[PDB]
Amino acid sequence: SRKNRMKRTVRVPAISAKIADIPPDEYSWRKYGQKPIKGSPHPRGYYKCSTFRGCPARKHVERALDDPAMLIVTYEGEHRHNQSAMLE
Ligand SMILES: [Zn+2]
Question: How far apart are CA 3 and CA 9, in angstroms?
Answer without folding.
Answer: 21
